[model samples]
Target: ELVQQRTQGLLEKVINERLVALARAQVSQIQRELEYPLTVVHGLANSTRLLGEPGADGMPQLNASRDEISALLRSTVQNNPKLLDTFMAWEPNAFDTDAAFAGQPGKGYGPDGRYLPWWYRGADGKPIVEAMADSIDSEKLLPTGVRENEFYACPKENKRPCIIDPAPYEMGGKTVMMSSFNVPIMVGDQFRGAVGADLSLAFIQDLLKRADQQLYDGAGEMALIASNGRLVAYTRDDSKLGEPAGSVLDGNEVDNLKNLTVDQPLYDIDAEHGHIELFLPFTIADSGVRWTLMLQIPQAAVFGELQQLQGELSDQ
Candidate 1:
């Protein structure tokens, strides 16, 4: 069946242009979203650590509990002992969880140092955690079937979490104390736990919601996949959340991106993961995770948008 090559070429040109524009804009939006929340979280954690009343030494958990964290904020990165402890306790978890662990981009938590998680160090270059006696969880906790993130705690998995069991068997079932800051938290270079409130997925929800509102209602759907492409936030596809990060690139999409990279305008990997469909870069995140603000606008809606753009271009 011989088809009209000219028509296909024209259609390709139009679609390619719109898609690039869409990708660029959406990528910018994703960058904003990622930056905004990280900024917010850091600001909140740092500010909360500061701007509070100084604590009395023994006020039955009220003074230090209230003022100590705030005081840490006032302490600089070098001078703040408490903040340093908190960082030592939490950086492994946050860095590892974010796919920013020592190994590859997506591989969190490499080998532990004789002293640290192998990330931080002093001028002597020894593991700082080891030197500080802060690398608490020295044993490998993974062999007993604990997740990479929950090696130090209990062995059971949290069905609700699909990660570690929330209840602490080793800690005598005491209320688990998350790390000092909310920046994910790790002890001994493995994920110990997170502090503060919930995972703060609200911003992700807002991102997906805004994506839906701005784009066509039903092209496919939009989701906020983690750097590893696990669904962090999504709309219209509840079942896909725990799926692999590569799922979005499976089947036709990968081929499309691959093909588009060649003679098609400025085809490249999407990196924005913005308010709309964003393809974020792998390196921008410490996690080496690649997030995407995905949109599956129907073929027809995409065509319509392209046609509209063409009409405007013609008028101009």
Candidate 2:
């Protein structure tokens, strides 16, 4: 037989503080991973203006800048396994007098001669760089006189740094939640092109699963959601990747979460499931992408010690 406990919020306060400690570590790790590529992409974009100023491929043989820039991209992706791709796309002949080779059949030329070079890690752990042959699709862009692919079109249209909302992306026969961060490269009066990097957040699922296992034996669940209401990570459902949060939550609740104005954490008692759910909201700076991490634990796990204390006092 169990007796009722007195009303003191200290237990709730302690639980909330504990959960926040676990949640904070996760957010800090994600922020560190995100900061690397954003800084790298911005640096690449800044260097483009000085290196790609249209001029006679100044002393063609001595034009080591081209090699150096491409090497910089290759070195970054090759050394960092977290990166998926890095690229620089420039307008045809605008970067140099290289459009002379425009009509020629060779590396990455679309006959339209846009300079879209992509550097990415190969399956064997080496980095490879190439602009896909005929990369500028006239079919996609009647605007195709100039091609509008995601990498170039996005920054060109926004004319600002952008962090594309996370989406399911398949690269090299592998699938993951990949978000692209891009910076527009401009020269004086023209929208020259873009420099960008891609990061796959798929590993986040594993990260949360490990934390859940460490904290609560069988009574804990964890989830991460993107600002767009997509489930970024949910320890309860492996198949929920890239799906709407409404699938497992009330639509209204997701709507409210999407509209968060204040950076306050939320706590709710799920009477139906007999669990406590806590939410920690954070924004990925520069990207401005809002992400929330949630942790759920059975009520028994929280109040068990309180019940034990009450029983000891009753025995006395």
Candidate 3:
């Protein structure tokens, strides 16, 4: 029994160290992939001259801006098929129009709502918001006027780029899980609005699944834990998405994971059937969004052969 314990303990240490290095490498790759969309948003938001100028109507003229943004969105989506949508959502004062704007033929562009040039592919696998008329009010547009306009509101409030985790919301009359990367559109010192891209939660789910496949020959699972203890992505069961990670994880493990300020590996011995849980915290440099990458490897997978060896020795 003493020999078995020593061998198993050493194996566990080696496994933990391997998991830490692997998780950090994977997280770094994901961080690079995620930064691409935000980079696109930042580049376009800064290069646009329209948001910086005052229009004839004494407000920023968005017609030309809309055309330019639409073209850029087309090219962006063509290159990035995973991108669900790209748009520029403005503050109410970003445009100039009369009170009858919202009552006009299509969705008006002014404080009553927003100057949103949204881009998304339709059922035909073609760009949906092709024409200006297609830009008309749809329940799918970001709720800039509603109570939950975090896509633009968060970045504007922080005065920098930001990332929001998955949330269920209405889009084109159907509800789906979506996340966004938003960058504030600034002109000089004034905050005009924000440019951003929307991504389906499946992106993160797929990433988690791929990461899990590389762990202990499929005997492991991976998850993305939000700062609020919610599971953003879970390889074993996606149904846990948006649920508090503590509900399934040990309370002590959850507490330690939450308190992690740097990249450190945590071990949870009681994590669902005697598995080893590894937690690595990752923070986005631009947005300050913090998330944890967790890998759960079953002890049996790592120590099964050693256990068999101990049994044979005892028999001898």
Candidate 4:
């Protein structure tokens, strides 16, 4: 009875805290926006520039000087060997041959056949345009799901920000959630296209580690997902260094992120002892994407709530 009670109380506490933290993060985001919209753009531009200039391939490959970051950023947008010249350039013709999806499964080209689309053959070589398509469409930019069998048509499976199912290919059976976050790459009050990242439970383990180290005491798991229900990253580690991201689990018997859902509060949790779970629906980055950050703490370790319960029982 005590364990169950404690677990329930801790669960509620964890959920509340997670919610508060998520709200705080969002509030901070809004505050930043209100306080310095210009600053945000300038900072993003400078960061983009400093992230380095694109190679002849227009791929961002070299770090630019701080002073020249903005100019280089503008130049990058114009000469970006990757993105489309204009959003309108492909309005009804959204697919670009370079990074365009060839409208087929297992029939597209990308770096080393690692996985990419046909319209995505731009110099950057990652099908970022298709990714953008996936992002926009996932966010309801288009009709319900991809337009089936159209010319520039590609199977939902091939698009980045991929529409069919959002997750790593191998995570077919693991619990998963697909969500996206868009960091608007803006300039001069106009909305430039967003530099979005796909949020999958299968891909966010590294980010969770980074967040855990920087924010929590490696006591949390972070998740990023698209509103459309895809797992960008779902990761956890009890070994201190924890589980490394990008680990693939095969076989039909294993459970993972690919099978998770937004409606399910916790993703495939298996009743661990003395551990508390916190769920936070988070807005990652400053853009339009639906995502959540989950933080799980071993209740016995962090709050010592379990220990306290034991002490109370001893007194009884």
Expressed as tens digits, the lDDT of each residue in 64-116 for candidate 2 is 44557677777778776778888777766766666555764334344556666
TM-score of each: 0.40, 0.75, 0.74, 0.35
Of 1 and 4, the candidate ranking higher by TM-score: 1
Off by over 4 Å in 1: 1-8, 36-70, 73-199, 245-287, 300-316
Q: Rank the candidates by TM-score, best first.
A: 2, 3, 1, 4
Runs of candidate 2 with Cα error greater than 4 angstroms are 1-6, 52-68, 91-101, 104-106, 123-126, 132-154, 157-160, 169-175, 186-191, 305-316
Q: What is the C-alpha lDDT of each candidate?
A: 0.37, 0.70, 0.69, 0.36
Instruction: Give the per-residue lDDT of model 3 (tens digit) for 99-145.
Output: 43453323324334346666777788776552222333333433222
lDDT tens string, model 1, 1-316? Answer: 1354565567667665665565455556645544432343344344432222234662222223322432342233334322322222233333224333333311112343211221222465332322222233444443222333442222112211122211111122322211111243322333333322112234444556565665565454655444333455556654444455366544344333322221123333333432223343321233222334455455566556757765775688
Candidate 1: residue 158 Cα off by (Å):
28
Of the pair 3 and 4, which is ahead by lDDT? 3
Question: Which is superior by TM-score, 2 or 4?
Answer: 2
**True lDDT of residue 145, candidate 1:** 27
lDDT ranking from best to worst? Answer: 2, 3, 1, 4
Cα deviation at 255, candidate 4, in Å, is 15
Candidate 1 is scored at a TM of: 0.40
List ranges where model 4 is wrong by over 4 Å: 1-19, 26-207, 214-219, 237-274, 282-288, 303-316
Error of 2 at 198 (Å): 2.1
